[PDB]
């Protein structure tokens, strides 16, 4: 959906946001994007807070 595209393009900003803070090079940030991509599809993103579901996401990468 376009709303599905609009919420990831919103989230594309936010995982890139903390990568600037922690001096994260880009190949972690793009690699963690797929982990958020599947966890959105696997109905994990609903209910939890937005900043909590991305901070837990990129630590795995």
């Amino acid at each position: 959906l376009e709303s599905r595209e609009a919420t990831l393009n919103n989230a594309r900003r936010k995982l890139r946001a903390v990568s600037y803070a922690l001096h994260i090079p880009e190949y972690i940030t793009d690699a963690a994007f797929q982990w958020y991509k599947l966890a959105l599809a696997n109905n994990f993103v609903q209910g939890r807070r937005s900043q909590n579901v991305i901070a837990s996401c990129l630590y795995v990468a």
Binding site: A17, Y20, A21, Y27, A31, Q34
Partner: protein, 1114 residues
Amino acid sequence: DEINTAQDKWHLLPAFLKVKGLVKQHLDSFNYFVDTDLKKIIKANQLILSDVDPEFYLKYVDIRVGKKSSSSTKDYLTPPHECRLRDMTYSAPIYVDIEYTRGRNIIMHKDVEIGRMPIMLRSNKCILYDADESKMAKLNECPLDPGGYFIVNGTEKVILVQEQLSKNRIIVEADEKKGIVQASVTSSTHERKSKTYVITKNGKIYLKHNSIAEEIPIAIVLKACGILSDLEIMQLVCGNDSSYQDIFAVNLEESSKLDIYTQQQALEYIGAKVKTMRRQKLTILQEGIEAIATTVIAHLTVEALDFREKALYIAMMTRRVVMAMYNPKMIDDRDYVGNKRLELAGQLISLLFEDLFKKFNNDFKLSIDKVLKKPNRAMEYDALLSINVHSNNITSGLNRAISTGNWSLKRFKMERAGVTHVLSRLSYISALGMMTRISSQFEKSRKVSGPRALQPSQFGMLCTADTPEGEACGLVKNLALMTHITTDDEEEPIKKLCYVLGVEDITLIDSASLHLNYGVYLNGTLIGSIRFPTKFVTQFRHLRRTGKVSEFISIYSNSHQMAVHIATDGGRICRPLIIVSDGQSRVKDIHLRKLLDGELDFDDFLKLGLVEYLDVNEENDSYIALYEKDIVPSMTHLEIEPFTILGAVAGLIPYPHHNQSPRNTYQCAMGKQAIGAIAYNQFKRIDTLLYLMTYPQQPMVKTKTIELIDYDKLPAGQNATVAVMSYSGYDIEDALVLNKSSIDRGFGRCETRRKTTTVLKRYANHTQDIIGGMRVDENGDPIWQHQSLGPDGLGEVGMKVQSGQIYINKSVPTNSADAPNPNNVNVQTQYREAPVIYRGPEPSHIDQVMMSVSDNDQALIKVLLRQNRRPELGDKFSSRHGQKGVCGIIVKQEDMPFNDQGIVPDIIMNPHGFPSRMTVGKMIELISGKAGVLNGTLEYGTCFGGSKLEDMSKILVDQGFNYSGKDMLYSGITGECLQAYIFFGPIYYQKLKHMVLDKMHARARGPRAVLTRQPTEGRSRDGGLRLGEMERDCVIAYGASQLLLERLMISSDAFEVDVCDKCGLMGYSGWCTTCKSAENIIKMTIPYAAKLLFQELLSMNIAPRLRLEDIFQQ
């Protein structure tokens, strides 16, 4: 050495360049930006505030670039040569201190990092500042490097020196058929980009502006400023007893038609015809909106209550436009040099900085009020925990603007591009000649030869004989040898200073006295209405030379109009010359001796009162002398040194004043293409495509210019023994002839070094790139492609490569974009090969290879290939006096002639150039060279002087040769004497670029374009040349009609199309697909570029129906 002030005024010109260099413009502009202007930006965007939580604030108190305040060390910083091998940005951190309200208490914190500032070399913030070639030996940088350029992400770039028309002044124009217009552009630093026009429609003056929808006659708008008595207006514009009153006589009645006649009605006439601001204030007055319409106009001057000086400033603007119609000679051109403001780099990067710095914090205030609208997170919340999220928006904004030289601003909305350029490292001076060059504005005056030509107001202002040709023919210009750029100081206290000198005030004078007297102009604006200016102006020079007022002020004083000018705007051209009071100068040779003692530098000459700066406008009033043997008792401002009129890339011509002037620009365009040394660290740097000469030599006839830039310390080109003559017919017009032996002894064996790079890249599925190599066969490692690939996959150092023969083996995972399955089930065989094959027609060597990391954790592979070559025929040589020349053949030594001693000349050129090219300089340099060798002394060839001829002929006639070098020598092919005499000596032949081993290419049958099936333009894309439209006309003028099709569709664009007879258009392999019959189909062949036209024109509603006949049965 009895020193005198006659010929030793030269010996302070090094004393200028020593303390005050040649990269004055880029050092002093950027270093002023670092100290002063950075405080001036945060004081303009202090005190960020939010509407929610109104008791919250954060304030910027100060700004420091470089060190911290705790450690108070210099810094710990990356070396620049270490930075340029890792493709990093040579930067320095930005540190501020901030005070804010955490909560119950307010709290001030120090040393907050925001971003990294890329800073130029040899500035006071870099570690190269004031080194002693021992730290710089440890930092392996060249001491002879000028500096003044950035090292953003690898490649080294430099910002050029821009210029535009003189902002914040008035300029007059003359147009034939659409009437005549006057323009005045103004731009203060707050939202202002406004230009004002004075149009003369059908004999009636009008004023149009880009905020007013209509044109307004001037008799309203000065009555709107309070001046309404309407006999003032005739007396201001015209004066008295002239033809101007009859010229103005039509303009007055437009006030009478609308019947305003008063100051009250004169405002709202304008504001009833303005379409601006869209009612931003919901409480309009409709009478107050013309006071601000009188405020956003003519932004030179502002007002408080009287509207006095802005009124007459329109009238002084209007006096020019009436005088324009009285005679068209009074209009001045916009290519006079005084109408040009040379605008530098450091005062231009500041315009991008404050635009981008306010884009930082307004995005930062959106990152706090999202939190401040929370009930639970409203007490313990801190702001600068999230300062780092916007930190990477000032680094990648600056590093993009410098890498891609197009600066997108918001407050002005203007999109100039190409403001930065890669500096060319072909020669030493090529990297120095690009430091002093000017890129213009290209104001779309392509029809007018005005800006293309050269104006006489340029002598010593900037260089004259170095300007490119071709497309860029006259819009690129170059600075002089002695040149300083002014800077503004202040206009406020000098306005207080002239009132001490006995000048009147603007709000007191009558209309009568101002045209009778003269008037001071402050930056184009009258303030004082001075009388008898000669007592006023000459005391002010005595105030300036004593040094109470700053020295960069000009007292340009014309006499066509009745006015004098005061200029303090800064950023305009000037050069210094020494003051002469009367028929005796202020030379004082004992001061010139006290300079050479070492305590009297060049700055003290202007402090004591013995030198002063003159712009282009002060050189109106001056009467510059040439020589001390040319002093008159009516003569001021002796000129310091007459050969300082040539640029540093033009200065290497020996004795130019004998040589022709069009043969100077041909050399100055080639001098940047001369091969020689580069730098001391040239065996350490890894640059893209970098040539060297093996055996360089300093030239025989030097110049005073080239010893100031230390060209002799690392020269370009070598001096060989020329015998100018015709020989074997292989040199007809300016070809060259040389011997096989001297190349075999090593005559200029150049050497080509070339970079190539690749990046190991990490994917999203956590896969790297591996360097597996040397697959083996039949008991041996090396395949024909693998004799120089080494154990680790990196090509082995010290051995050659040929076509094929992979030198770096790069293997890529085949799952380049597949999704990460969180498992490890089958990952063992996925690396497909993607190597880089060494192409090229000649065997080259591997010099060395290094590997390192970038700014992110990501590996690099950079090998520098190496090859040298011998100067075989085809290679373009030069002569340093503007003679292009290509090697015709290569003779042996037996065929060459020889003198009585048996000296064999090196290069042959025919005598048939010197009458046409009028190059007298080579005819006298060869005399100046030969006598110096036998005396063992190097001779100076300067402009406007140097060593003479008659003292030089005395030297070699004592050695026993001919008295003007015109020797005689036997023939090598037959033995006997030659009937004429020869001309002989050593001349300095420097090799150029454009060698022929990397220009020969041929495309027999190769790749085709995907859209046109045509050969691919570009030699690196395998070529295939364009038989253009102009050659297609020349074929049919022969009347040949059979190769015309063969060269345009057979060998190029043959394509076979089946077309149907009825309903004629094409179909695929065997069909018609609009009458599906597969029957009436005829096979022919057409151009593919005509076939796709029968699809592209068929895409819109036009149907090219074809109609067919047979050839036979006429």
